[PDB]
Paper text:
Even though the exact mode of secretion via T2SS has not been fully elucidated, the role of GspL is anticipated to help in linking adenosine triphosphate (ATP) hydrolysis to the assembly of the pseudopilus, which together constitute the two crucial steps in exoprotein transport.
The continuity of the strand β1 of crystal form 1 is compromised due to the adoption by Leu327 of two distinct conformations, with only one of them providing extension of the strand. On the α1 side, close to the N-terminus of the helix, the side chains of Leu306 and Ala313′ establish a heterotypic interaction which is complemented by Ile316′. The core of the interface is constituted by two interactions between symmetry related residues: the first involving Leu309 and the second involving b-conformers of Leu327 (bottom panel seen clockwise from top left). The distance between the main chain atoms of β1 and β1′ of crystal form 1 is in the range of 4.5–5.0 Å and is drastically greater than the equivalent interdomain in crystal form 2, which are instead within hydrogen bonding distances (2.8–3.0 Å). The electron density of the inter-strand region of crystal form 1 has revealed the presence of an ordered water molecule positioned halfway between the main chain nitrogen of Leu327 and the carbonyl oxygen of Phe329′ (red sphere). In this regard, crystal form 2 and the V. parahaemolyticus crystal form of GspLfld appear as closed versions of the dimer whereas crystal form 1 exploits a novel conformation, resulting in an open variant of the interface.
Author numbering:
A (entry chain A), B (entry chain A): 303 to 382
Write the structure that this text describes.
């Protein structure tokens, strides 16, 4: 039982990004992962966030991205 | 936009409790709160966790508790 700590680290890293907002999350104790629906100004900020999460030791996948107006929405799955 | 940081602090505090497991959570960016379905050995551990969360500066409510076998299930709502 450590997954909520993973969301802790992700919370620090994502908190370090002013341009990113977390619209949704899907915490699955069964699957052993947590999904974050996040929004950013562009895809490069999203890749910066995935890189920072991966460098902090977390297993992270970034996908399901699409631009909607002035922002881009994507899914960051933390956990392995 | 600071609610995910609230889940960060709650993640530290709850991580400091070996007897407590987080079975569910309900992250509501709209309502400005997050709900945690947690399990513990007894109600006193639950009140210890609510007290530690409240003392760390978080607004927390503990309720909807019921014993089911050897453990007790309850709802901790963080956010105000
Ligand atoms: C103000 C945004 C800075 C950043 O891109 O992190
Ligand atoms: C796993 C990332 C995605 O949602 O594509
Ligand atoms: C707006 C385009 C999309 O998100 O599919
Ligand atoms: C082993 C449990 C200690 C505690 O109650 O925190
Ligand atoms: C608010 C706490 C509860 O679920 O009763
Ligand atoms: C088992 C009793 C209950 O949770 O209501
Ligand atoms: Br946010
Ligand atoms: Br871009
Ligand atoms: Br991980
Ligand atoms: Br846990
Ligand atoms: Br008790
Ligand atoms: Br709060």
């Amino acid at each position: 039982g450590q997954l909520l700590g993973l969301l802790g680290q992700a919370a620090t890293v994502i908190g370090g990004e002013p341009t990113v907002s977390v619209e949704q999350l899907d915490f699955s104790a069964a699957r052993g992962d947590v999904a974050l629906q996040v929004r950013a100004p562009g895809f490069d900020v999203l890749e910066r966030l995935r890189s920072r999460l991966s460098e902090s030791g977390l297993a992270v996948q970034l996908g399901s991205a699409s631009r909607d107006g002035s922002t881009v929405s994507a899914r960051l799955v933390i956990g392995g």
